[PDB]
Each structure stands twice: as structure tokens, then as C-alpha cells.
Coordinates of all heavy atoms in Angstrom, one line a residue:
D1 N -10.0 -19.5 9.7 CA -10.2 -20.4 8.6 C -10.0 -19.7 7.2 O -10.2 -20.3 6.2 CB -11.6 -21.0 8.6 CG -11.7 -22.0 9.8 OD1 -10.7 -22.5 10.3 OD2 -12.9 -22.3 10.1
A2 N -9.6 -18.4 7.2 CA -9.4 -17.7 5.9 C -8.1 -18.0 5.3 O -8.0 -17.8 4.1 CB -9.5 -16.2 6.2
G3 N -7.2 -18.6 6.0 CA -5.9 -19.0 5.4 C -6.0 -20.1 4.4 O -5.4 -20.1 3.3
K4 N -6.9 -21.1 4.7 CA -7.0 -22.3 3.8 C -8.0 -22.1 2.7 O -8.2 -23.0 1.9 CB -7.5 -23.4 4.7 CG -6.5 -24.0 5.7 CD -5.4 -24.9 5.0 CE -5.1 -26.1 5.8 NZ -4.4 -25.7 7.1
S5 N -8.5 -20.9 2.5 CA -9.4 -20.6 1.4 C -8.7 -20.6 0.1 O -7.4 -20.5 0.0 CB -10.2 -19.3 1.6 OG -11.1 -19.1 0.6
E6 N -9.4 -20.5 -1.0 CA -8.9 -20.6 -2.4 C -8.9 -19.2 -3.0 O -9.9 -18.4 -2.9 CB -9.7 -21.5 -3.3 CG -9.3 -21.6 -4.7 CD -10.1 -20.7 -5.6 OE1 -11.0 -20.0 -5.1 OE2 -9.8 -20.6 -6.8
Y7 N -7.7 -18.8 -3.6 CA -7.6 -17.5 -4.2 C -6.9 -17.7 -5.5 O -6.5 -18.8 -5.9 CB -6.7 -16.6 -3.3 CG -7.2 -16.5 -1.9 CD1 -6.7 -17.4 -0.9 CD2 -8.2 -15.6 -1.5 CE1 -7.1 -17.3 0.4 CE2 -8.6 -15.6 -0.1 CZ -8.1 -16.4 0.8 OH -8.5 -16.4 2.1
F8 N -6.8 -16.6 -6.3 CA -6.2 -16.6 -7.6 C -4.7 -17.0 -7.6 O -4.1 -17.4 -8.6 CB -6.4 -15.4 -8.4 CG -5.8 -14.1 -7.8 CD1 -4.5 -13.7 -8.1 CD2 -6.5 -13.4 -6.9 CE1 -4.0 -12.6 -7.6 CE2 -6.0 -12.2 -6.3 CZ -4.7 -11.8 -6.6
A9 N -4.0 -16.7 -6.4 CA -2.6 -17.0 -6.2 C -2.5 -17.8 -5.0 O -3.3 -17.7 -4.0 CB -1.8 -15.7 -6.2
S10 N -1.4 -18.6 -4.9 CA -1.1 -19.3 -3.7 C -0.6 -18.4 -2.6 O -0.2 -17.2 -2.8 CB -0.1 -20.4 -4.0 OG 1.2 -19.9 -3.9
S11 N -0.6 -18.9 -1.3 CA -0.2 -18.1 -0.2 C 1.2 -17.7 -0.2 O 1.6 -16.6 0.3 CB -0.5 -18.9 1.1 OG 0.6 -19.6 1.5
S12 N 2.1 -18.5 -0.8 CA 3.5 -18.2 -0.9 C 3.8 -17.0 -1.7 O 4.6 -16.2 -1.4 CB 4.3 -19.4 -1.3 OG 4.5 -20.4 -0.3
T13 N 3.2 -16.9 -2.9 CA 3.4 -15.8 -3.8 C 2.9 -14.5 -3.1 O 3.5 -13.4 -3.2 CB 2.7 -16.0 -5.1 OG1 1.4 -15.5 -5.1 CG2 2.7 -17.5 -5.5
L14 N 1.7 -14.6 -2.5 CA 1.2 -13.4 -1.8 C 2.1 -13.0 -0.7 O 2.3 -11.8 -0.5 CB -0.2 -13.8 -1.2 CG -1.3 -14.2 -2.2 CD1 -2.5 -14.6 -1.5 CD2 -1.6 -13.0 -3.1
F15 N 2.7 -14.0 0.1 CA 3.6 -13.6 1.1 C 4.9 -12.9 0.6 O 5.4 -12.0 1.2 CB 4.0 -14.9 1.9 CG 5.2 -14.6 2.9 CD1 5.0 -13.9 4.0 CD2 6.4 -15.1 2.6 CE1 6.0 -13.7 4.9 CE2 7.5 -14.9 3.5 CZ 7.3 -14.2 4.6
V16 N 5.4 -13.4 -0.6 CA 6.6 -12.8 -1.2 C 6.3 -11.4 -1.6 O 7.1 -10.5 -1.4 CB 7.1 -13.7 -2.3 CG1 8.0 -12.9 -3.2 CG2 7.8 -14.9 -1.8
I17 N 5.2 -11.2 -2.3 CA 4.8 -9.9 -2.8 C 4.6 -8.9 -1.6 O 5.1 -7.8 -1.6 CB 3.5 -9.9 -3.6 CG1 3.8 -10.7 -4.9 CG2 3.0 -8.5 -3.9 CD1 2.6 -10.8 -5.8
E18 N 3.9 -9.4 -0.5 CA 3.7 -8.6 0.7 C 5.1 -8.3 1.3 O 5.3 -7.1 1.8 CB 2.8 -9.3 1.6 CG 3.2 -9.2 3.1 CD 2.2 -9.9 4.0 OE1 1.1 -10.3 3.5 OE2 2.6 -10.1 5.2
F19 N 6.0 -9.2 1.4 CA 7.3 -9.0 1.9 C 8.1 -7.9 1.2 O 8.7 -7.1 1.8 CB 8.1 -10.3 2.0 CG 9.5 -10.2 2.6 CD1 9.6 -10.3 3.9 CD2 10.6 -10.0 1.8 CE1 10.9 -10.2 4.5 CE2 11.9 -9.9 2.3 CZ 12.0 -10.0 3.7
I20 N 8.0 -8.0 -0.2 CA 8.8 -7.0 -1.0 C 8.2 -5.6 -0.7 O 8.9 -4.6 -0.4 CB 8.7 -7.4 -2.5 CG1 9.5 -8.7 -2.7 CG2 9.2 -6.3 -3.3 CD1 9.4 -9.2 -4.1
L21 N 6.9 -5.5 -0.8 CA 6.3 -4.1 -0.7 C 6.4 -3.6 0.7 O 6.7 -2.4 0.9 CB 4.8 -4.2 -1.1 CG 4.4 -4.8 -2.5 CD1 2.9 -5.0 -2.6 CD2 4.9 -3.8 -3.6
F22 N 6.3 -4.5 1.7 CA 6.5 -4.0 3.1 C 7.9 -3.7 3.4 O 8.2 -2.8 4.2 CB 5.9 -5.1 4.0 CG 4.5 -4.8 4.5 CD1 3.4 -5.2 3.7 CD2 4.3 -4.2 5.7 CE1 2.2 -4.9 4.2 CE2 3.0 -4.0 6.2 CZ 2.0 -4.3 5.4
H23 N 8.9 -4.4 2.9 CA 10.3 -4.1 3.0 C 10.5 -2.7 2.5 O 11.1 -1.8 3.2 CB 11.1 -5.1 2.3 CG 12.5 -5.3 2.9 ND1 13.6 -4.5 2.7 CD2 12.9 -6.3 3.8 CE1 14.6 -5.0 3.4 NE2 14.2 -6.0 4.0
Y24 N 10.0 -2.3 1.3 CA 10.2 -1.0 0.8 C 9.5 0.1 1.7 O 10.2 1.0 2.1 CB 9.6 -0.9 -0.6 CG 9.9 0.5 -1.2 CD1 11.1 0.8 -1.7 CD2 8.8 1.4 -1.4 CE1 11.3 2.1 -2.3 CE2 9.1 2.6 -1.9 CZ 10.3 3.0 -2.4 OH 10.5 4.2 -2.9
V25 N 8.2 -0.1 2.0 CA 7.5 1.0 2.7 C 8.0 1.1 4.1 O 8.1 2.2 4.6 CB 6.0 0.8 2.6 CG1 5.6 0.7 1.1 CG2 5.5 -0.5 3.3
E26 N 8.3 0.0 4.8 CA 8.7 0.1 6.2 C 10.2 0.5 6.3 O 10.5 1.1 7.3 CB 8.5 -1.3 6.8 CG 7.1 -1.7 7.0 CD 6.5 -1.2 8.3 OE1 7.0 -1.6 9.4 OE2 5.5 -0.4 8.3
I27 N 11.0 0.3 5.3 CA 12.4 0.9 5.3 C 12.2 2.4 5.1 O 13.0 3.2 5.8 CB 13.2 0.3 4.2 CG1 13.8 -1.1 4.7 CG2 14.4 1.1 3.8 CD1 14.4 -1.0 6.0

């Protein structure tokens, strides 16, 4: 149930930021 909670940013922006950082570090 933690996905539907409220945060300062929406889930899509968090996913995009995580994708960018993880792309760099995992490459």
C-alpha cells in the first residue's frame, strides 16, 4: 500500500529520476 501514498513528487517523476541514476550507475 506504499505506492498509493502521497509524496512531494508524483510516482512518474520518481521513476524517471531513478531510471536515469540507475542507468548511469548500472552501466
Side-chain angles (χ1 to χ4, degrees):
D1 288 343
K4 290 281 223 292
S5 181
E6 178 262 359
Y7 311 92
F8 63 91
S10 82
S11 91
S12 278
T13 90
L14 299 173
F15 170 73
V16 161
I17 294 177
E18 142 182 345
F19 181 84
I20 293 175
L21 304 168
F22 261 83
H23 212 274
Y24 182 75
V25 301
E26 292 271 298
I27 281 311

